[PDB]
Ligand binder design. Structure first.
Ligand SMILES: NS(=O)(=O)c1ccc(C(=O)NCc2c(F)c(F)c(F)c(F)c2F)cc1
Ligand SMILES: NS(=O)(=O)c1ccc(C(=O)NCc2c(F)c(F)c(F)c(F)c2F)cc1
Ligand SMILES: [Hg+2]
Ligand SMILES: [Zn+2]
Length: 258
C-alpha cells in the first residue's frame, strides 16, 4: 500500500515503487566532521524571514507541515552555497520514539532527538512543481533538536498539535515567526542530496546547521502524541518518521567553518 515508516512499508521497501531510492545523491547522510572539507569560498547564509506569512498547519500522515505564503519574496534564503533566491514554502520535523533517535542526518554517527527541515524552492523556476525537476530546485535548512531547556519559539507549534491529531486534519496557523526556531550561529555543512521521503527526488542542496537548538522533554513528548492514521482508524503513534543515513558515494560534504 502507500509508503510509511512501518515494518511493511518503511524505508527499506521504498525502492520498490521509487527506484531512485538507490540513487547517487540520496539523503540523509552521516556527517563525518573529520572528512568534511572547509571551503573558504562558501558565503555566509542570508536568512530573511522578517516578512514570513505562515498560513496553515497540517497533519499529512507522515509529519506535520506548517505552510507559508510563497507567492512573493516574503521569507527567503540566499547566500551560502546557493545561487539565486529560494522561498520558504513549509517546515516540518522528523522525530523519534526515544530521545536518542529522531534526526535523519547524523554527526559522527550521533543521532539527535529530532530534525527540523525548512523547505525552500528556487524562484527562477516559477513554481515548486517545476523546481523539483531541477538539480538545484530546492534548498532545505536542517536544524537538529536536542532535549534540554524549552525553546519558547516552538511552543505555539506544540500547543496547536491537539487540533491536528490525525491524518488530514489542518488548522489555521497565522502570524508564526520562524526566526524563533534558529540557533544563534549559522555555521553549516552543505552537500547535494534529495528529498528524504518519496518521491525521493534528487533536487536538494542541503544546508545542515552545526549548532542544534534545545527543546524540553515536554515539548518533544507532544510531537509523539500525533497519529499517522486518520480519524476512526486504528491508532498508530506518529514516531520514528525518519529515514536512515544513505551512502555518501561520490559526494563531498563542505563546511563553512574550520
Ligand atoms: N503558497 S501556499 O498556498 O501557502 C502553499 C503551501 C504549501 C504547499 C505544499 O505544501 N506543497 C508541498 C510541496 C512542497 F512543500 C515542496 F517543497 C515541493 F517541492 C513539492 F513538490 C510539494 F508538493 C503549496 C502551496
Ligand atoms: N524531509 S525533506 O527532504 O525536507 C522534504 C521536503 C519536502 C517534501 C515534499 O514537498 N514532498 C511533497 C510532494 C508530493 F506529495 C508529491 F506527490 C510530489 F510529486 C512531489 F514532488 C512532492 F515534493 C518532502 C520531503
Ligand atoms: Hg531534480
Ligand atoms: Zn524532512
Amino acid at each position: 500500500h502507500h509508503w510509511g515508516y512501518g515494518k511493511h512499508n518503511g524505508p527499506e521497501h521504498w525502492h520498490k515503487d521509487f527506484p531512485i531510492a538507490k540513487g547517487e545523491r540520496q539523503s540523509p547522510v552521516d556527517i563525518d566532521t573529520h572528512t568534511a572539507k572547509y571551503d573558504p569560498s562558501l558565503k555566509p547564509l542570508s536568512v530573511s524571514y522578517d516578512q514570513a506569512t505562515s498560513l496553515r498547519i497540517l497533519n499529512n500522515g507522515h509529519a506535520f507541515n506548517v505552510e507559508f505564503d510563497d507567492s512573493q519574496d516574503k521569507a527567503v534564503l540566499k547566500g551560502g552555497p546557493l545561487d539565486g533566491t529560494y522561498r520558504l514554502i513549509q517546515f516540518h520535523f522528523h522525530w523519534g520514539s526515544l530521545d536518542g533517535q529522531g534526526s535523519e542526518h547524523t554527526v559522527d554517527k550521533k543521532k539527535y532527538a529530532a530534525e527540523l527541515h525548512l523547505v525552500h524552492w528556487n524562484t527562477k523556476y516559477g513554481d515548486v512543481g517545476k523546481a523539483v525537476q531541477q538539480p538545484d530546485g530546492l534548498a532545505v535548512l536542517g536544524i537538529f533538536l536536542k532535549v534540554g531547556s524549552a525553546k519558547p519559539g516552538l511552543q505555539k507549534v506544540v500547543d496547536v498539535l491537539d487540533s491536528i491529531k490525525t491524518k488530514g486534519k489542518s488548522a489555521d496557523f497565522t502570524n508564526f515567526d520562524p526566526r524563533g526556531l534558529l540557533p544563534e550561529s549559522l555555521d553549516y555543512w552543505t552537500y547535494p542530496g534529495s528529498l528524504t521521503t518519496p518521491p525521493l527526488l534528487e533536487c536538494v542542496t542541503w544546508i545542515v546547521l552545526k549548532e542544534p537548538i534545545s527543546v524540553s522533554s515536554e515539548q518533544v513528548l507532544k510531537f509523539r502524541k500525533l497519529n499517522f492514521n486518520g480519524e476512526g482508524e486504528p491508532e498508530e503513534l506518529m514516531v520514528d518518521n525518519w529515514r536512515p543515513a544513505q551512502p555518501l558515494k561520490n559526494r563531498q560534504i563542505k563546511a563553512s567553518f574550520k
